[PDB]
Amino acid sequence: VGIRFCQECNNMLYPKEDKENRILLYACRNCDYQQEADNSCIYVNKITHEVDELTQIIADVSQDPTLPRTEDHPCQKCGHKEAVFFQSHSARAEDAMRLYYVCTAPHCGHRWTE
Amino acid sequence: EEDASQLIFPKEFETAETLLNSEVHMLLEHRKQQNESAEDEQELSEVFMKTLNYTARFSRFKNRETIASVRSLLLQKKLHKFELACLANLCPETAEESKALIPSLEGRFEDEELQQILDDIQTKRSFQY
Amino acid sequence: AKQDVIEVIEKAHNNELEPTPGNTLRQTFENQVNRILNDARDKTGSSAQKSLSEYNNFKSMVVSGAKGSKINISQVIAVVGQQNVEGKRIPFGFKHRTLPHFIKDDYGPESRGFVENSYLAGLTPTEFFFHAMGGREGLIDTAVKTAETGY
Amino acid sequence: MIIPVRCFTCGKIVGNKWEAYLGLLQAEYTEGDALDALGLKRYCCRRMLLAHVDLIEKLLNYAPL
Amino acid sequence: HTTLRKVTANTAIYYDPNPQSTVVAEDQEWVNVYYEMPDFDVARISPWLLRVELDRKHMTDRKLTMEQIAEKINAGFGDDLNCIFNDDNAEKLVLRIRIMN
Amino acid sequence: DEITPDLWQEACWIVISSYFDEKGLVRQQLDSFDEFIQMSVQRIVEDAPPIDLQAPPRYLLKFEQIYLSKPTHWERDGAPSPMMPNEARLRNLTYSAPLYVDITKTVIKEGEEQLQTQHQKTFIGKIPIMLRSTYCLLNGLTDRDLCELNECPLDPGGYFIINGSEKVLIAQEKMATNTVYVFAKKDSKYAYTGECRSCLENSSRPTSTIWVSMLARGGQGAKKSAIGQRIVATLPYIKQEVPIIIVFRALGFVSDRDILEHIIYDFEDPEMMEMVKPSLDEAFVIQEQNVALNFIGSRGAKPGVTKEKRIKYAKEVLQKEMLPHVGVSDFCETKKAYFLGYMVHRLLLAALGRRELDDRDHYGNKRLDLAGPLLAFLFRGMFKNLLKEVRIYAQKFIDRGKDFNLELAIKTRIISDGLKYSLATGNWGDQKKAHQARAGVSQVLNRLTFASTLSHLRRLNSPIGRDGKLAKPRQLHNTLWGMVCPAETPEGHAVGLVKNLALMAYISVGSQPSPILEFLEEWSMENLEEISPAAIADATKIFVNGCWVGIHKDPEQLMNTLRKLRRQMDIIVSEVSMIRDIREREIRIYTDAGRICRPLLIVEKQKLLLKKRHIDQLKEREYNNYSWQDLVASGVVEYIDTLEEETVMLAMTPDDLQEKEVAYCSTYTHCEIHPSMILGVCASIIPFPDHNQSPRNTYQSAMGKQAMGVYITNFHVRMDTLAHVLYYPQKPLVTTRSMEYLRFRELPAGINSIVAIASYTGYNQEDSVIMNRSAVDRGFFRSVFYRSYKEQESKKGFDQEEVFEKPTRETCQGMRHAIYDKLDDDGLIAPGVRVSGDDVIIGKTVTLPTKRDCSTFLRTSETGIVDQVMVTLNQEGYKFCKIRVRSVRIPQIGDKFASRHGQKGTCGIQYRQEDMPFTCEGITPDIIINPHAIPSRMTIGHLIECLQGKVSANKGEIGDATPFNDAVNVQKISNLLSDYGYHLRGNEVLYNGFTGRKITSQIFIGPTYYQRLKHMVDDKIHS
Ligand SMILES: [Zn+2]
Ligand SMILES: [Zn+2]
Ligand SMILES: [Zn+2]
């Protein structure tokens, strides 16, 4: 799923398979340098793409004045009552309706979902 | 007894193929070039000069490549030859304008597909500035 | 109705709401909220019709059926109703908020254009703009309707 | 441009009252109090004085021919 | 009309050097028994894979079955590729597709 | 201390009063022209390319500086006499000022001796001057001086007088430049569009747009399906779509990793990485930069014959044609690539759905072009042609070896006639150029009513062409709140395309971004060229007019400092707006013109910065050297644009933010002064518009303009083709607070009427009304009509010429049967002569090769008396005269009368005072309307206005018509009425005039304001 660059020309390392050693190794085309891949995975594709939005939410949204703030749900690792919450901004998840909470502390930046 | 809106006109013109205003300028230029230098003849008639200005002023295309591309693009469709030059010469801004100006198009062209054709002409026609 | 809408919003916020098999969660929520607001206008409007006395001039016009309609009286006395745009509620022109005053990702009655004030009482500043948006659609539709129908 | 001679509704004279109306306003009298002094019991005539504009004042600024 | 997109959850292309490797740990339990029968294994098999997951919720609505999906893939595309299906009772449905021998 | 809620209502209106006193209603018109005439005109001349002439003798001509003088009139004598704006209208000549440019020429004849000569104030041409502008003759003049010049002090100006016609440059909305927008179109062969039109500052080169599109997955192929979705970018001068990856290679980033660094900022995220993989496959074969340059040049518009030429053409296209705004030199490859990568990055977010698609109708994405920006583009058309004329004229001179005089080289006609042409015809741009001019601009100012004149000046136009067609300009968007009046819109096919600016809203005049750019450098801001790509993942992006200034480590501290500078009127001007896209870690700063914004009270810690002391100074705004500008200086109020309004919280009134049982929002950043300011000029004059239906408010906007009344004060001196003036324009009994700023109170366009809503004799249907004949005889709605007849005697032909004299039957051969005794010995009818039917009012004859009569008769058969006669000399010097025919129109059964809201109603029948239904006190209603209109095609505000009018007249106080004032209520008005011996609901017992028996139903009667519409039966029938 990831992308790796060779050390010679810093170019794409397309997946290549050798018939002698029977091992998949990421080999560059223009440069003869080739490196083995330990993941043994070329790529993945989530058709439903149900990726958690917590990683996508940025911690710097605490200072946003427009975003609503509710004290009902406190931060897990802080205890601060104030917590800013909002709905998913991703168009893919627009069909679903959910709330994501972020700690209002200046430096915590913790994101969690109930 | 003839009407352009109803696609009725003398049968002789059916065999003729329409030409664009910009394209005609090229043909006039070819005629102008040979007369000016190739042969020593009388100066070109005032009619030739008058239409040359009209074609140049209303020329919607710069070079032959742009003219050929539009001609080829419109040839793929079932556009009638009379509409071929008339649409390109008019350069309607939108599909609605073309149908009102050209009643024939609205008979066999939908409001969506024709719009995808006029906008293509817009990308081909260029401005001096 | 306003409290009921909040309850529906809370259910969807907590994921308690279950979408119908024939619709998705986002569309299902819009349907449930619309019925609550639509039902309130009809129920309140119907009560307004019974409110008018025989001597009342508003009742005389509608009773005879000459001019006006029961809906017009409802918007004058009881409530104007929801201001739908393009067949739906007011869209989020800004980022997830209909107007700057409303908080982000607000799906409440006032935020989405529900007009709870009758013409006689007077609309709030937010409602006036939402009312204009609904009226603008009608004028545009009316302008094109005559052109197409005449053709 | 100028105050009408008489009320358009009934016909009571209101032009002559305009001169006294302005004089009463600068005399610390209330807008409605001045109307009572002039003797405008009907609201139709009070309209002709309460909410009247004397545009001729600005026109007179321009010099004549 | 339903497509594989509406019934599939996720897909990936994994690498397995030998047929018995099955680098994926979770599916190793069920692929082994199915692969014991030398079906299409008469010769060398490419070390590539096209494992694709199927959404459980979508299958219930359409009342689809693993054999039905596999049959269409083989019949629709022909003998260009071979597909392997897992047990329906499993919580997660695994569909492994490899090019034909 | 603080503003108590019981006092906020008066305090809120005081600050608004200062805003209009300082800024005004046409500040947006004047400001843009002032910027255009002060800097843009200089920039065009300064930024002109050097003029080079060759055929040994080298001539280099450069323009040093531009000098502009105040308007003057040049007669046959040539003296620079001052030209008053009023004189221009009377003489039917353009109101304009001379333009002078300094030209310095350096000539070298290969003799190793360089000498130059100085040309001081070369008569390049002239520039039309907007009225009341900095260069106008009526700037900073007291009201007393304006009257001496026969100009209305209340007239706001802001228009151009061309050939005696007042023209207003209608603002044309355009898509914002130097901004990245991602739109989804289902008709295109590609799924997504990376449209981003990029232009330099004000305008150095024509706007260039590049669409970084992404091919859709619908197509299927042997290799296309494998890679799937790939990004293709079309260059402005490349016909075919070239992969975006190859573009970066042409820039110089040969390494593939560098390509991913600029596009993908977060390498940890794998979702975006997979999307860019297919794009690399197409560009993989092109590894060397030279090959990439060769690849792009292959499909160029004019490919070079030799291989090396293809690289050069591609190098110039990418360096200059592509992304001009980010960089125009040859050492901006790094900067250009970063912007290009951002466009791809923006596309990736939209494609994955993590970023919402840009809204087409969002006004933040649209810029407004005023007279300044519009004329700036036009000025380049003539100036560019001016150089060609000089070059062509000198070309024949240079090859002959003799020096060419500059006096002949510079063409005055192109500069003068070029601007005068479009401003008069309305077809924008030069006519010779073979294109389609943008019509509808510079329309004739509507002087029928003062309110109409104000609305026209603030009028806006929706975009035309692809931009307008794709979007829905007619539909009302949320961004119009406080910026464009929602109710006001013309009715018809062009509904919603034409709008009006909001009262408080104004369009940014424009400023240089240099002070802002220098500010960032001294702070923690770091430019892209210094940092590595890895530092952009966590930092926030900074944009200045769409330029990639560089990321910033801490966004919170910088914005707080930036906000403080804006409030303090520091190097950052209050006009400048800063936008903080928190969800995207993007900080956008815009300084270009065309940005619509409105003032907003600043709220800090749930507390207004506007204190009692600020209001106290405002209350004494006069003679205290205090104005609105001081408020912005103190930081109490700033300006928010559409983009900044995106991330700015607002509060309707202080009562909403002061405290609530349940805190809707505990963090309020700004508070609106008063919501009623959203209404436009025509909508502001409507009481209780909220009580009124939306179509009715829109309908009034059209009717209000058509209403007849005193448009200005200096109507007698001027001459207009159509001008309706009311006998008794009376200020309404019910007036809105915003009405004071519009000055509609001073110059109203209607007369109040005691309207009893009843069905009398059945002579009024839904569209009709019954008047009082006796009232009209007293001057109820009578108005005057002015039609100006204009003619000139010009010597067009040497043999045949026009003259002014009496067309005697003997000397004249061809003539039309008419009475000619009206004409005097000079051929002009003197003022004070009654004219009726077909009559000659001006004598003109042509001496054909015996003379033929060609005089002008009355347009219609109306009976009128000539008011004044004017004799002048036109611009050509020939004798020219104007005469204004005055006629009196008495309201009759055919005239159309319209209330302040609802559909216009024709006067079904006129009844004498005796026949009208009198009440107990003997008050026959002046007008009777059909009750059946109220339900649907009318509003309850008519009944409320009637109730307010009755209370206002009875209590002798002008009622308040604030749309959103909680103090005014129907119940409160009813209680006040009951104190004066009247029904609380306003119903009264009306005795039928014909039969004295009491009517069973008690009629509702009140003094409702009414206006007379221009539509009159006499005009139609007399035609
Ligand atoms: Zn390599
Ligand atoms: Zn925390
Ligand atoms: Zn009276």
XYZ file of N, CA, C and O in Angstrom, chain F residues 554-656:
412
model
N 3.573 28.359 13.685
C 2.451 28.535 14.601
C 1.403 29.435 13.961
O 1.677 30.625 13.731
N 0.201 28.934 13.650
C -0.803 29.786 12.997
C -1.541 30.696 13.965
O -1.949 31.802 13.598
N -1.720 30.241 15.207
C -2.515 31.001 16.166
C -1.861 32.339 16.490
O -2.516 33.388 16.460
N -0.565 32.323 16.806
C 0.109 33.553 17.209
C 0.143 34.566 16.071
O -0.106 35.759 16.283
N 0.450 34.111 14.854
C 0.550 35.035 13.729
C -0.789 35.700 13.435
O -0.851 36.915 13.214
N -1.872 34.920 13.428
C -3.181 35.490 13.129
C -3.596 36.499 14.191
O -4.157 37.554 13.869
N -3.330 36.197 15.464
C -3.639 37.151 16.521
C -2.868 38.449 16.325
O -3.427 39.542 16.477
N -1.581 38.349 15.987
C -0.814 39.545 15.653
C -1.369 40.216 14.403
O -1.490 41.445 14.349
N -1.716 39.422 13.387
C -2.286 39.988 12.169
C -3.607 40.689 12.457
O -3.870 41.777 11.932
N -4.453 40.078 13.291
C -5.725 40.703 13.637
C -5.507 42.024 14.361
O -6.215 43.005 14.107
N -4.529 42.070 15.269
C -4.249 43.308 15.990
C -3.836 44.419 15.034
O -4.274 45.567 15.176
N -2.990 44.099 14.053
C -2.562 45.108 13.090
C -3.744 45.637 12.288
O -3.840 46.843 12.029
N -4.655 44.749 11.885
C -5.823 45.184 11.127
C -6.680 46.143 11.943
O -7.162 47.155 11.422
N -6.883 45.839 13.227
C -7.678 46.710 14.084
C -6.969 48.021 14.397
O -7.638 49.009 14.719
N -5.642 48.054 14.310
C -4.863 49.239 14.645
C -4.534 50.102 13.433
O -3.807 51.091 13.577
N -5.049 49.762 12.251
C -4.751 50.505 11.026
C -3.245 50.590 10.790
O -2.716 51.628 10.390
N -2.551 49.485 11.041
C -1.111 49.411 10.834
C -0.869 49.139 9.347
O -1.770 49.293 8.518
N 0.354 48.748 8.981
C 0.715 48.519 7.584
C -0.350 47.674 6.894
O -0.578 47.809 5.687
N -1.005 46.797 7.649
C -2.138 46.036 7.131
C -3.382 46.910 7.232
O -3.740 47.375 8.319
N -4.041 47.134 6.101
C -5.210 48.003 6.056
C -6.445 47.216 6.472
O -6.526 45.996 6.289
N -7.422 47.924 7.045
C -8.672 47.277 7.433
C -9.368 46.649 6.234
O -10.122 45.682 6.388
N -9.129 47.185 5.035
C -9.718 46.608 3.832
C -9.243 45.176 3.619
O -10.006 44.324 3.149
N -7.985 44.893 3.960
C -7.443 43.554 3.779
C -8.184 42.577 4.680
O -8.589 42.917 5.801
N -8.366 41.352 4.191
C -9.066 40.304 4.917
C -8.178 39.074 5.028
O -7.495 38.700 4.069
N -8.193 38.448 6.203
C -7.442 37.228 6.465
C -8.422 36.107 6.773
O -9.335 36.281 7.588
N -8.232 34.961 6.122
C -9.132 33.821 6.236
C -8.345 32.644 6.795
O -7.252 32.334 6.307
N -8.902 31.995 7.814
C -8.245 30.898 8.521
C -9.052 29.623 8.295
O -10.028 29.363 9.006
N -8.646 28.828 7.306
C -9.272 27.533 7.044
C -8.671 26.525 8.014
O -7.660 25.879 7.735
N -9.310 26.391 9.178
C -8.753 25.560 10.240
C -8.728 24.094 9.821
O -7.740 23.386 10.052
N -9.808 23.615 9.202
C -9.884 22.209 8.822
C -8.841 21.830 7.778
O -8.560 20.638 7.609
N -8.265 22.808 7.079
C -7.281 22.546 6.039
C -5.906 23.120 6.354
O -5.003 23.008 5.517
N -5.717 23.721 7.529
C -4.435 24.320 7.901
C -3.981 25.334 6.854
O -2.800 25.412 6.509
N -4.927 26.119 6.343
C -4.655 27.119 5.320
C -5.065 28.492 5.832
O -6.194 28.672 6.300
N -4.149 29.451 5.742
C -4.417 30.846 6.067
C -4.313 31.640 4.773
O -3.234 31.722 4.172
N -5.428 32.225 4.347
C -5.505 32.952 3.088
C -5.686 34.437 3.366
O -6.614 34.833 4.080
N -4.799 35.250 2.802
C -4.858 36.703 2.915
C -5.088 37.260 1.518
O -4.322 36.963 0.592
N -6.140 38.059 1.365
C -6.505 38.644 0.083
C -6.417 40.159 0.176
O -6.954 40.760 1.113
N -5.741 40.770 -0.798
C -5.608 42.216 -0.869
C -6.107 42.802 -2.181
O -6.201 44.030 -2.293
N -6.433 41.972 -3.168
C -6.899 42.473 -4.451
C -8.285 43.097 -4.314
O -9.009 42.873 -3.340
N -8.650 43.892 -5.316
C -9.926 44.588 -5.320
C -11.051 43.633 -5.721
O -10.827 42.470 -6.066
N -12.281 44.139 -5.674
C -13.439 43.356 -6.054
C -14.002 42.469 -4.970
O -14.911 41.680 -5.251
N -13.498 42.570 -3.743
C -13.976 41.748 -2.637
C -15.090 42.484 -1.904
O -14.867 43.566 -1.350
N -16.282 41.898 -1.903
C -17.425 42.487 -1.216
C -17.349 42.132 0.263
O -17.180 40.962 0.628
N -17.466 43.144 1.119
C -17.395 42.944 2.559
C -18.270 43.980 3.247
O -18.608 45.018 2.670
N -18.633 43.685 4.491
C -19.487 44.552 5.285
C -18.918 44.706 6.686
O -18.240 43.804 7.188
N -19.176 45.837 7.342
C -18.674 46.023 8.706
C -19.399 45.128 9.698
O -20.554 44.741 9.498
N -18.703 44.803 10.786
C -19.262 43.962 11.835
C -18.631 44.338 13.166
O -17.412 44.509 13.248
N -19.460 44.464 14.198
C -18.949 44.721 15.536
C -18.138 43.528 16.024
O -18.544 42.374 15.864
N -16.986 43.811 16.620
C -16.095 42.775 17.128
C -16.496 42.433 18.555
O -16.750 43.322 19.377
N -16.556 41.138 18.850
C -16.922 40.633 20.168
C -15.724 39.893 20.743
O -15.155 39.016 20.082
N -15.343 40.247 21.968
C -14.217 39.631 22.659
C -14.700 39.090 23.995
O -15.244 39.840 24.812
N -14.496 37.792 24.216
C -14.882 37.137 25.464
C -16.351 37.404 25.786
O -16.717 37.741 26.914
N -17.200 37.245 24.772
C -18.641 37.449 24.919
C -18.948 38.855 25.431
O -19.845 39.055 26.252
N -18.196 39.839 24.941
C -18.392 41.226 25.342
C -18.078 42.132 24.162
O -17.022 41.997 23.538
N -18.997 43.046 23.863
C -18.802 43.971 22.756
C -17.659 44.932 23.054
O -17.532 45.450 24.167
N -16.818 45.171 22.044
C -15.769 46.174 22.177
C -16.321 47.590 22.085
O -15.663 48.530 22.542
N -17.509 47.761 21.509
C -18.145 49.070 21.411
C -18.757 49.414 22.764
O -19.730 48.785 23.192
N -18.190 50.411 23.436
C -18.618 50.801 24.769
C -19.473 52.063 24.701
O -19.708 52.637 23.636
N -19.948 52.500 25.871
C -20.785 53.694 25.931
C -20.016 54.930 25.480
O -20.573 55.804 24.806
N -18.735 55.021 25.844
C -17.944 56.188 25.465
C -17.865 56.331 23.951
O -17.926 57.446 23.420
N -17.728 55.211 23.236
C -17.703 55.270 21.778
C -19.010 55.830 21.230
O -19.004 56.656 20.310
N -20.143 55.392 21.784
C -21.431 55.918 21.349
C -21.566 57.385 21.737
O -22.129 58.190 20.986
N -21.056 57.757 22.913
C -21.153 59.145 23.352
C -20.436 60.077 22.383
O -20.954 61.145 22.038
N -19.241 59.688 21.933
C -18.536 60.488 20.937
C -19.303 60.526 19.623
O -19.372 61.570 18.963
N -19.889 59.394 19.225
C -20.662 59.355 17.989
C -21.890 60.252 18.079
O -22.256 60.917 17.102
N -22.546 60.279 19.241
C -23.714 61.138 19.409
C -23.369 62.592 19.117
O -24.194 63.338 18.575
N -22.154 63.011 19.467
C -21.643 64.345 19.161
C -20.711 64.318 17.957
O -19.714 65.042 17.913
N -21.027 63.483 16.963
C -20.114 63.264 15.844
C -19.732 64.570 15.158
O -18.627 64.683 14.615
N -20.621 65.557 15.159
C -20.344 66.828 14.511
C -19.526 67.726 15.434
O -19.594 67.617 16.660
N -18.717 68.588 14.820
C -17.887 69.593 15.483
C -16.915 68.997 16.499
O -16.270 69.749 17.240
N -16.765 67.674 16.539
C -15.848 67.022 17.465
C -14.701 66.305 16.765
O -13.906 65.637 17.434
N -14.592 66.425 15.441
C -13.530 65.768 14.679
C -13.546 64.256 14.903
O -12.501 63.608 14.979
N -14.746 63.691 15.010
C -14.938 62.255 15.160
C -15.803 61.742 14.018
O -16.812 62.362 13.666
N -15.404 60.610 13.441
C -16.103 60.028 12.305
C -16.071 58.509 12.427
O -15.559 57.951 13.402
N -16.631 57.838 11.418
C -16.672 56.379 11.427
C -15.268 55.786 11.392
O -15.008 54.751 12.017
N -14.351 56.424 10.662
C -12.997 55.892 10.543
C -12.343 55.708 11.906
O -11.515 54.806 12.079
N -12.695 56.547 12.882
C -12.116 56.411 14.214
C -12.504 55.082 14.849
O -11.707 54.479 15.578
N -13.726 54.611 14.590
C -14.166 53.345 15.166
C -13.274 52.198 14.708
O -12.863 51.354 15.513
N -12.960 52.153 13.413
C -12.068 51.114 12.907
C -10.672 51.286 13.490
O -9.974 50.303 13.768
N -10.240 52.535 13.684
C -8.926 52.779 14.270
C -8.839 52.206 15.679
O -7.833 51.587 16.045
N -9.884 52.403 16.485
C -9.901 51.870 17.841
C -10.057 50.356 17.876
O -9.855 49.756 18.937
N -10.405 49.729 16.755
C -10.535 48.288 16.701
C -11.871 47.741 17.146
O -12.015 46.518 17.252
N -12.854 48.602 17.416
C -14.164 48.112 17.836
C -14.859 47.390 16.687
O -15.561 46.395 16.899
N -14.680 47.875 15.459
C -15.348 47.325 14.286
C -14.317 47.095 13.191
O -13.436 47.932 12.966
N -14.428 45.955 12.512
C -13.591 45.621 11.368
C -14.483 45.120 10.238
O -15.712 45.100 10.349
N -13.854 44.709 9.139
C -14.558 44.280 7.939
C -14.292 42.804 7.679
O -13.154 42.339 7.787
N -15.351 42.076 7.334
C -15.287 40.645 7.066
C -15.819 40.399 5.660
O -16.916 40.858 5.319
N -15.046 39.680 4.851
C -15.463 39.328 3.504
C -16.170 37.974 3.518
O -16.345 37.343 4.563
N -16.582 37.516 2.333
C -17.308 36.252 2.247
C -16.451 35.089 2.729
O -16.924 34.231 3.485
N -15.186 35.039 2.304
C -14.317 33.946 2.722
C -14.052 33.991 4.223
O -14.089 32.955 4.897
N -13.780 35.181 4.766
C -13.568 35.295 6.205
C -14.867 35.095 6.974
O -14.853 34.542 8.079
N -15.995 35.532 6.408
C -17.288 35.235 7.010
C -17.542 33.737 7.070
O -18.404 33.290 7.834
N -16.807 32.956 6.276
C -16.928 31.504 6.331
C -16.541 30.971 7.705
O -17.189 30.059 8.231
N -15.487 31.529 8.303
C -14.960 31.066 9.581
C -15.119 32.111 10.683
O -14.334 32.140 11.634
N -16.127 32.972 10.571
C -16.397 34.014 11.555
C -17.804 33.809 12.098
O -18.767 33.732 11.327
N -17.918 33.721 13.420
C -19.214 33.571 14.065
C -19.879 34.931 14.230
O -19.214 35.934 14.510
N -21.200 34.960 14.063
C -21.968 36.194 14.111
C -23.097 36.065 15.124
O -23.572 34.965 15.416
N -23.517 37.211 15.659
C -24.643 37.294 16.578
C -25.606 38.355 16.070
O -25.180 39.446 15.676
N -26.901 38.034 16.077
C -27.893 38.955 15.528
C -27.927 40.258 16.317
O -27.828 41.349 15.740
N -28.068 40.167 17.632
C -28.147 41.328 18.502
C -27.410 41.024 19.796
O -27.196 39.856 20.135
N -27.008 42.058 20.541
C -26.329 41.804 21.821
C -27.165 40.988 22.789
O -26.605 40.234 23.595
N -28.493 41.119 22.739
C -29.345 40.340 23.630
C -29.145 38.844 23.427
O -29.321 38.060 24.367
N -28.781 38.429 22.212
C -28.579 37.008 21.948
C -27.305 36.496 22.607
O -27.266 35.360 23.095
